[PDB]
Amino acid sequence: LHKEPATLIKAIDGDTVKLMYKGQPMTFRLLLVDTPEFNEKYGPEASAFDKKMVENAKKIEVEFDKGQRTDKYGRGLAYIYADGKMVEEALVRQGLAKVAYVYKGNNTHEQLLRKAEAQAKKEKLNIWS
Ligand SMILES: Cc1cn([C@H]2C[C@H](OP(=O)(O)O)[C@@H](COP(=O)(O)O)O2)c(=O)[nH]c1=O
Ligand SMILES: [Ca+2]
Fold it and tell me: Which residues contact 50 (CB under 8 A, 6 or more apart)?
């Protein structure tokens, strides 16, 4: 797997972000996680967390897994990194996202993310409180 350049266009919610990728505006849906919608408990906190990581990042990168790269709504499916920190891992570790939507050719970071989620659970943090 490799990391590719991208730039922030704008933060959307806890697991969606608008980026410029190969010079094209594009909605990215984070692989392997689910954040609450904004209108649900921990949604605003998840939005705020993601926003902070991406807006304060000097460098954003996009990393596709080996399976499909666009979903049925035309969103990009990637892991997102902000100055080398994976956004999915930070959210899950904070208990603002669940490991979710784990499909077959697109699950390289599943174990890593489940570890993060185990700690958040043991802390009874946010979603797990
Ligand atoms: C994260 C992810 C979501 N999706 C689709 C499945 C879900 O479809 P349905 O909308 O039909 O339930 C939807 C959930 O995204 P959101 O959690 O952003 O709504 O996005 C994928 O197809 N692949 C993925 O890797
Ligand atoms: Ca969601």
Answer: 11, 13, 14, 15, 17, 35, 87, 91
Distance in angstroms (rounded) separating the CA atoms of residues 20 and 36: 24
Backbone angles phi, psi at 43, to 5 degrees: -70, -50
| Fold classification of 1-129 (topology level) | OB fold (Dihydrolipoamide Acetyltransferase, E2P) (2.40.50)
Q: Which two tokens stand for residue 65?
A: 């897994």
Question: What is the C-alpha end-to-end distance of the chain, expressed in Å?
Answer: 34
Catalytic residue among 37, 63, 69, 110: 37
**Looking at ligand 1, which residue's alpha carbon is closest to its atom 25?**
31
Q: State CA 117 to chain mean position distance.
A: 14
Q: Is 35 annotated as a binding residue?
A: yes
**Element containing residue 48 per DSSP (H, E):** helix 43-55
Closest by CA to 62, choosing from 49, 76, 50, is: 76
Technique used: X-ray
Tokens of 40: 């649900």
